Amino acid sequence: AGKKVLIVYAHQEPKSFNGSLKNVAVDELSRQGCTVTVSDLYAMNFEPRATDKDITGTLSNPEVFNYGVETHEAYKQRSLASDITDEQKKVREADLVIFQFPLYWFSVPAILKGWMDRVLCQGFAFDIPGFYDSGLLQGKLALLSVTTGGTAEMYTKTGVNGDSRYFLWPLQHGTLHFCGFKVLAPQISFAPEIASEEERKGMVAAWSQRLQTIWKEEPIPCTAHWHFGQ
Amino acid sequence: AGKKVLIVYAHQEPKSFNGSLKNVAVDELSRQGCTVTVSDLYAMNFEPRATDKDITGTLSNPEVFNYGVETHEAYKQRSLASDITDEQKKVREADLVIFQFPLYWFSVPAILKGWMDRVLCQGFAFDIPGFYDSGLLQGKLALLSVTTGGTAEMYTKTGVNGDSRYFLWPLQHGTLHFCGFKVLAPQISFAPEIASEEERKGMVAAWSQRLQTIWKEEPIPCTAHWHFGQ
Ligand SMILES: Cc1cc2nc3c(=O)[nH]c(=O)nc-3n(C[C@H](O)[C@H](O)[C@H](O)COP(=O)(O)OP(=O)(O)OC[C@H]3O[C@@H](n4cnc5c(N)ncnc54)[C@H](O)[C@@H]3O)c2cc1C
Ligand SMILES: Cc1cc2nc3c(=O)[nH]c(=O)nc-3n(C[C@H](O)[C@H](O)[C@H](O)COP(=O)(O)OP(=O)(O)OC[C@H]3O[C@@H](n4cnc5c(N)ncnc54)[C@H](O)[C@@H]3O)c2cc1C
Ligand SMILES: COc1cccc2c(C)cc(=O)[nH]c12
Ligand SMILES: COc1cccc2c(C)cc(=O)[nH]c12
Ligand SMILES: [Zn+2]
Ligand SMILES: [Zn+2]
Numbered sequence: 001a002g003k004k005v006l007i008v009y010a011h012q013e014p015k016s017f018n019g020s021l022k023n024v025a026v027d028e029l030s031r032q033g034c035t036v037t038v039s040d041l042y043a044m045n046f047e048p049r050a051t052d053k054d055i056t057g058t059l060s061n062p063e064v065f066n067y068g069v070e071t072h073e074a075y076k077q078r079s080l081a082s083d084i085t086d087e088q089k090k091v092r093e094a095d096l097v098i099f100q101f102p103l104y105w106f107s108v109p110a111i112l113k114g115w116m117d118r119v120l121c122q123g124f125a126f127d128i129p130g131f132y133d134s135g136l137l138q139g140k141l142a143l144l145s146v147t148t149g150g151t152a153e154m155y156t157k158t159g160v161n162g163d164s165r166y167f168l169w170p171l172q173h174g175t176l177h178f179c180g181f182k183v184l185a186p187q188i189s190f191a192p193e194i195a196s197e198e199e200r201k202g203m204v205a206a207w208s209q210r211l212q213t214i215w216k217e218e219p220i221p222c223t224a225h226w227h228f229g230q
Numbered sequence: 231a232g233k234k235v236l237i238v239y240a241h242q243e244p245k246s247f248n249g250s251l252k253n254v255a256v257d258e259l260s261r262q263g264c265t266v267t268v269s270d271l272y273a274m275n276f277e278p279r280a281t282d283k284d285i286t287g288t289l290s291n292p293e294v295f296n297y298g299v300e301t302h303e304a305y306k307q308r309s310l311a312s313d314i315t316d317e318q319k320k321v322r323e324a325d326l327v328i329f330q331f332p333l334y335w336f337s338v339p340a341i342l343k344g345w346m347d348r349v350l351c352q353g354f355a356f357d358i359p360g361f362y363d364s365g366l367l368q369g370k371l372a373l374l375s376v377t378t379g380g381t382a383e384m385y386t387k388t389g390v391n392g393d394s395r396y397f398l399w400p401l402q403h404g405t406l407h408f409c410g411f412k413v414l415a416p417q418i419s420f421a422p423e424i425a426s427e428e429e430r431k432g433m434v435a436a437w438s439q440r441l442q443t444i445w446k447e448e449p450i451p452c453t454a455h456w457h458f459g460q
Contacts, residue, residue, distance in 0.1 A: 012280070012281060012282065012295050012297060013294060013295040013296070015294050016294070016296075042279065042281065045279075048278045048279060048340035048341065048343075048344060049272070049275075049278060049340060049341045050242070050334070050339060050340065050341070051242060051272065052242065063245075064243055064245045064246070065242055065243045066243065066246075066423075067242060068379070104280070104343075104347050105343075105346050105347060105350075105400060105404055105405045106399070106400030106403070106404025106405065107337055107343065107400050107404070108343075109280060109343075109347060110278035110279060110280065110340045110341075110343035110344035110347050110348075111278065111279045111280070111340075111344075113278075113334075113335070113337065113338075113339075113340040113343040113344075114278060114340035114341075114343075116335050116340075117334050117335060117339060117340050118340075120335075132390060149298070149358070157454070160362060161404070162399070162403065162454045166399055166454070166457075166458065167399065167400050167404060169336070169392070169396050169397065169399070170335060170336030170337050170397050170400065171335075171336075173336075173392065174335055174336030174337070174391070174397060175335045175336065224387065224388075224392045224396070227396075228396065228458045230458075
């Protein structure tokens with residue numbers, strides 16, 4: 001409906017399976033009348049390193065540099081690098097944030113890890129206190145749309161990779177829940193490089209079709225039990 | 231003696247607590263007669279992004295860029311960027327790789343994420359297929375030395391952060407095990423910033439003491455059961 005979506009997208013190749021998933025999301029959400037923004041990290045050459053270049057003002061302690069202290073202070077003073085504050089404005093206005101990425105080492109590619117490290121700073125995304133259900137991005141929805149090398153069978157409790165939910169923990173809970181997001185169920189598109197033409201088409205359309213009803217979903221309970229069972 | 235250690239270190243500040251932990255590791259291993267090499271990622275301005283610049287000369291398929299494929303072929307045809315192959319030589323020669331970093335979003339800082347993404351390429355670290363135990367770095371030891379913001383109590387199974395072992399899974403299992411490493415128990419230095427001066431000394435001194443008999447240690451069983459089970 002009347003909602004803003006930010007898609008944070010992390011793939012080098014527009015003709016990729018990730019690129020297709022990002023474009024069907026843009027096409028489907030735009031069809032519904034949503035306001036849609038994409039941060040295409042590699043095309044923006046997004047800086048992933050957390051450095052002292054991310055602060056442009058007088059440092060709180062120029063003798064011993066502490067990235068988290070300095071960026072928290074910079075956020076309050078408005079002295080963060082503008083690439084960071086550009087992304088913060090997108091996130092502040094968004095009702096839903098979708099992350100579209102290939103799994104790299106059971107996690108996000110580094111360029112996207114750098115977006116989380118630098119954009120989700122203290123004062124903007126959380127405060128101490130003001131995290132988990134009290135995070136500063138409360139009200140907002142987030143969803144991981146992930147592609148894998150490994151097959152769905154590999155990513156089971158007794159498969160070699162363990163259950164797919166296990167590698168979701170640091171991203172869903174440690175990052176998105178910590179910032180206050182409600183987490184929608186992940187979209188995992190398994191092993192598209194191995195899959196047939198028709199399985200690949202089906203995976204694209206399953207995503208497109210789920211997006212038709214995304215505003216009707218409830219978030220997951222983003223708890224240890226959900227991720228690990230027991 | 232004779233062992234080679236590589237320390238891959240990811241902190242911006244030489245006077246940091248991470249910096250102190252890296253420096254006692256160098257002091258202690260050097261005292262024992264070990265060959266020691268440090269990759270100081272921030273001081274190297276190490277590139278974290280996985281891009282086509284990682285291949286020199288010409289591409290295996292310059293119409294559709296697939297990073298895994300292109301870097302696999304580059305590795306085989308000795309055509310990877312020299313920042314990558316410089317790291318790979320350090321890893322190839324090392325008996326033990328220590329990673330020293332502050333926890334960022336239940337994981338490694340993006341600069342060290344990019345080291346894993348770009349250094350541990352197919353053909354070097356693992357083959358498809360050719361992993362976990364068919365994994366090309368077998369024989370090597372790896373150890374995560376992590377500092378946290380949250381206290382040990384926060385990091386228990388019913389604490390807000392969940393168990394420490396839960397965030398360890400993508401690094402120890404999805405990355406280090408997958409590559410063939412035997413994984414030594416993690417060194418976790420919980421919450422240095424909230425001091426005291428004496429307890430901080432204590433944590434530096436336990437790390438130094440542990441490194442005294444590091445070569446006597448048995449690896450962990452790097453299993454779903456160790457990370458999640460009872
Ligand atoms: C550094 C690194 C670390 C990795 N770590 C892991 C890991 O820990 N665990 C794991 O499982 N995997 C891992 N992988 C594998 C990685 O997750 C997969 O290679 C990636 O998820 C595949 O997605 P893709 O977009 O690149 O696929 P592509 O190679 O782009 O897609 C496969 C095929 O789909 C085709 N296609 C594109 N669009 C469409 C469409 N509209 N309809 C039909 N077909 C289409 C493409 O043309 C291509 O033929 C790793 C890879 C790298 C490089
Ligand atoms: C982007 C980001 C994401 C984060 N995500 C998480 C997360 O997911 N989970 C989490 O728990 N935390 C997280 N943190 C917090 C982070 O892990 C801690 O801030 C960090 O681990 C502190 O380690 P440090 O080396 O920077 O401590 P420092 O601030 O460098 O130092 C601690 C104290 O020890 C002093 N010191 C240095 N050397 C010695 C010495 N030899 N003896 C005694 N004292 C010494 C220092 O001067 C300082 O006073 C995050 C931080 C950031 C910026
Ligand atoms: C290309 O596929 C891959 C590349 C790198 C790592 C993995 C892991 C850790 C599991 C998996 O199933 N596939 C992988
Ligand atoms: C400054 O401390 C922190 C910064 C950013 C994230 C965390 C998380 C996820 C848990 C925690 O205990 N502390 C954190
Ligand atoms: Zn959660
Ligand atoms: Zn394992």
